[PDB]
Amino acid sequence: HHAADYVLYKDATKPVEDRVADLLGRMTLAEKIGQMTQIERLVATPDVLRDNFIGSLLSGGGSVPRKGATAKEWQDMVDGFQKACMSTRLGIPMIYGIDAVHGQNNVYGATIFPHNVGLGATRDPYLVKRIGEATALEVRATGIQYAFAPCIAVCRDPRWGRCYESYSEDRRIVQSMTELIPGLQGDVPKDFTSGMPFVAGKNKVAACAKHFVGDGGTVDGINENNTIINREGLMNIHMPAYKNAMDKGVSTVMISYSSWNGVKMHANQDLVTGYLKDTLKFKGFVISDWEGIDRITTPAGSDYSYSVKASILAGLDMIMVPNKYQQFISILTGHVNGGVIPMSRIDDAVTRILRVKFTMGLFENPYADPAMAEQLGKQEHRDLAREAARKSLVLLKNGKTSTDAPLLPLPKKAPKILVAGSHADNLGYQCGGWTIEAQGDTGRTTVGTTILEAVKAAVDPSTVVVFAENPDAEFVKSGGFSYAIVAVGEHPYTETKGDNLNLTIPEPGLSTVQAVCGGVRCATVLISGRPVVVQPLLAASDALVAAWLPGSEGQGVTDALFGDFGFTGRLPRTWFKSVDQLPMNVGDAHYDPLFRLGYGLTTNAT
Ligand SMILES: OC[C@H]1O[C@@H](S[C@H]2[C@H](O)[C@@H](O)[C@H](O[C@H]3[C@H](O)[C@@H](O)[C@H](S)O[C@@H]3CO)O[C@@H]2CO)[C@H](O)[C@@H](O)[C@@H]1O
Ligand SMILES: *[C@@H]1O[C@H](CO)[C@@H](O)[C@H](O)[C@H]1NC(C)=O
Ligand SMILES: *[C@@H]1O[C@H](CO)[C@@H](O)[C@H](O)[C@H]1NC(C)=O
Ligand SMILES: *[C@@H]1O[C@H](CO)[C@@H](O)[C@H](O)[C@H]1NC(C)=O
């Protein structure tokens, strides 16, 4: 279709499948295996990307051009890598992935949304769609085209260090929140075939339903461990949201480090190929987790030849290596050259990778758009995050007896008020994990508004606001305070550092609440990724709010505390009386919660 040097795969007017087939039929084995290889920016150079025909790059948690980097610094980095990939013989653009799991959260100045557990408390799938939309814009602000989200784990045990990445213990709520997908990617057309990949164009991103499957079902919530449950329970609890993701055209699926009845997911041909591909008709690409193939073996990495064979035969398409690319490529080449892995398997993996790349427009818009940089941390997006934070809050108590005047909403005009606690003025704590670093951090780690700052922004000009991080009882009794707002809770974590068998918050936390509330009526704001032991905090407090990990926009908290809006959040998880009860989920035969799933007290707006 027209100049003498025409190449069908480069013609943007042609159908995606024809483009895929045209390009695939021109590729060498080295070109093919290159597409299946995703590497860390940390090991990427222009020559490495060209010489190994690399298909994809990622930033792992905290893998950044430098701390504090601007949106344009990110665009320039990604475009430098892209220029190298475009200079190859076939000029196949790379796709760049990142964990944009509550906003574009590795990036300084990105809006940070509530984590998933709080989003589940909103029961507002349209809010979550609008978050996916805003997140796509902030990811493309940085030149990145692919987000490793949503996590659709159904966390069945809050001792898991990733429980905050799960919208709920109830699969129906997780199903509902798959609306993130068409927010990130755009809505699928009317005619759409379930399981096809979809991204609307250069202002959207490829999404990733993760981690397939049962990552939330592991024994005692041990991260990356074994999920022991019969097929009926796997299909009833852990699988359903994957079908909703197919129906909404999720572009990619990431495999879990976990096992199902002792079989590693990264080696599970029956589930990856027999179920996802052949039964759900998934036609996008299947990506490993980080060194996921290495962890097939015990110890991890002890027979990488086997890891490559087992994973590729199971049906994985793209391997997040992410560092030892030379060894990966060499081993996979040898297996194909030996007949251990048939060309048909290679050609399927590459078909799927190319299908997502062509579908999303990456061959037409391989480079960043400098006009999108100003989307990062845009006030409209912060206003959305503030709405989300406020909707996510669950009011657990609002008065010590049935006869007390309700403490919340608090008056904005008072002579003097106290704001206290370890989490009242700590932006990193209020954001939790996957913020700037994987594990999060402490203090002013990005642009935002802490609880203290939000209080000062809300109150009448006549109200004197005193901050004391950990005041003693005398200080409170002598201070002439009308009331106190005290914020405490968990430190940031992810993955296996967050696995926690006791679920008691660090001190000083309870002791500050006791000191404060003993001297003046108090509203306790608990920041956590999950339910934690709460009776002692409840006993001390007049009012108590489960604010989860609300993100950068602390004014969401004060919007409800001062009555601009009423409390509407409902628990998306069971609140246990004791950790010896766990696991314990709604619907279990022996269900004895402190607060059941769905519990939440309400207030009306002033
Ligand atoms: O990020 C791509 C996919 O990565 C994997 S593993 C991911 C871990 O969940 C996270 O805990 C880990 O954080 C470590 C940093 O990489 C280290 O540099 C520092 S020293 O310590 C932290 C935590 O120990 O990072 C890994 C790489 O990002 C996930 O399971 C996927 O959900 C994620 O998409
Ligand atoms: C589960 O963790 C235990 C205890 O750490 C470990 O020995 C075992 O290999 C893990 N199992 C799986 C399947 O990951
Ligand atoms: C609870 O477990 C965490 C994480 O495993 C540990 O670091 C902490 O000290 C524990 N708390 C108590 C009271 O044992
Ligand atoms: C809040 O509004 C509801 C619904 O109108 C009402 O029934 C309830 O009495 C109200 N509570 C307060 C404190 O105004």
Q: Which ligand is nearest to the CA of 226?
A: 2
Answer whether 358's CB lies under 8 Å from 16's CB.
Answer: yes
Rounded to the nearest whole angstrom, what is the distance from the C-alpha of residue 98 to the centroid of ligand 3? 30
To the nearest 10 degrees (0 to 180), the angle between helices 16-24 and 343-359 is 140
Q: To test ligand 1's pocket by mutation, which of 41, 495, 496 has the most ligand atoms within 8 angstroms of CB? A: 495
**The Cα angle at residue 193 between residues 188 and 197, in degrees rounded to 5:** 60
Residue 476 has φ and ψ, to the nearest 5°, of: -65, -45
Q: Give the DSSP H/E element, type plus range, for residue 247.
A: helix 240-247
- In the numeric block, the tokens 């602000």 are attached to 141
Question: What's CA 258's distance to the chain center, in Å?
Answer: 18
CB of 198 within 6 A of ligand 1: the answer is: no
Which amino acid makes up residue 15?
P
**Cα–Cα distance list, 466 to 13, 129, 455, 456, 460 (Å):** 64, 38, 10, 10, 14
How many secondary structure helices (H) and strands (E) does the chain include? Answer: 21, 17
The conformation of residue 40, written as its DSSP 8-state character, comes to E
Alpha-helix runs per DSSP H in 363-501:
379-392, 427-431, 451-458, 473-478
Q: To test ligand 3's pocket by mutation, which of 500, 505, 510, 579 has the most ligand atoms within 8 angstroms of CB? A: 500
Residue 94 has φ and ψ, to the nearest 5°, of: -80, 155
Q: How many residues does the chain have?
A: 606
Whose alpha carbon is nearest atom 7 of ligand 3?
A: 500
199: how many CB neighbours lie within 10 A of its CB? Answer: 25
Q: Pick the closest to residue 143 from 100, 87, 114 (CA basis).
A: 100
539: how many CB neighbours lie within 10 A of its CB? Answer: 14
Give ligand 3 pocket residues (Cβ under 6 A). 500, 502, 504
Catalytic residues, which ones?
Answer: 289, 495
Q: What is the largest CA-CA distance in the chain?
A: 88
- In the numeric block, the tokens 């987790």 are attached to 289
Q: Pick the closest to residue 485 from 511, 465, 510 (CA basis).
A: 465
Residue 370 has φ and ψ, to the nearest 5°, of: -60, -25
Break the chain into its structural domains and give their ranges.
1-377, 378-563
Method used to obtain the model: X-ray
Burial of 465 (0-12, 13-18, 19+ CB in 10 A): middle
Token couple for 274:
């027999």
Spatial separation of the C-alpha atoms in residues 233 and 171, rounded to whole Å: 11
Q: To test ligand 2's pocket by mutation, which of 225, 256, 258 has the most ligand atoms within 8 angstroms of CB? A: 225
Answer whether 107's CB lies under 8 Å from 142's CB.
Answer: yes
Resolution as reported, in Å: 1.8
Whose alpha carbon is nearest atom 14 of ligand 2?
A: 225
Q: Pick the closest to residue 177 from 165, 189, 188 (CA basis).
A: 165
Answer whether 82's CB lies under 8 Å from 56's CB.
Answer: no
**Cα–Cα distance list, 575 to 276, 530, 571, 578, 585 (Å):** 33, 9, 8, 9, 9
Q: Which ligand is nearest to the CA of 227?
A: 2
Spatial separation of the C-alpha atoms in residues 479 and 230, rounded to whole Å: 59
Q: Which ligand is nearest to the CA of 507?
A: 3
Question: Which residues 6+ apart lie within 8 Å of 591 measured at CB?
Answer: 574, 584, 585
Q: Pick the closest to residue 304 from 338, 334, 283, 337 (CA basis).
A: 334
Rounded to the nearest whole angstrom, what is the distance from the C-alpha of residue 298 to the centroid of ligand 2? 10
Spatial separation of the C-alpha atoms in residues 284 and 20, rounded to whole Å: 12
Token couple for 198:
């979809």
Token couple for 123:
């029961």
Rounded to the nearest whole angstrom, what is the distance from the C-alpha of residue 409 to the centroid of ligand 4? 13
Answer whether 338's CB lies under 8 Å from 43's CB.
Answer: no
Whose alpha carbon is nearest atom 5 of ligand 3?
A: 500
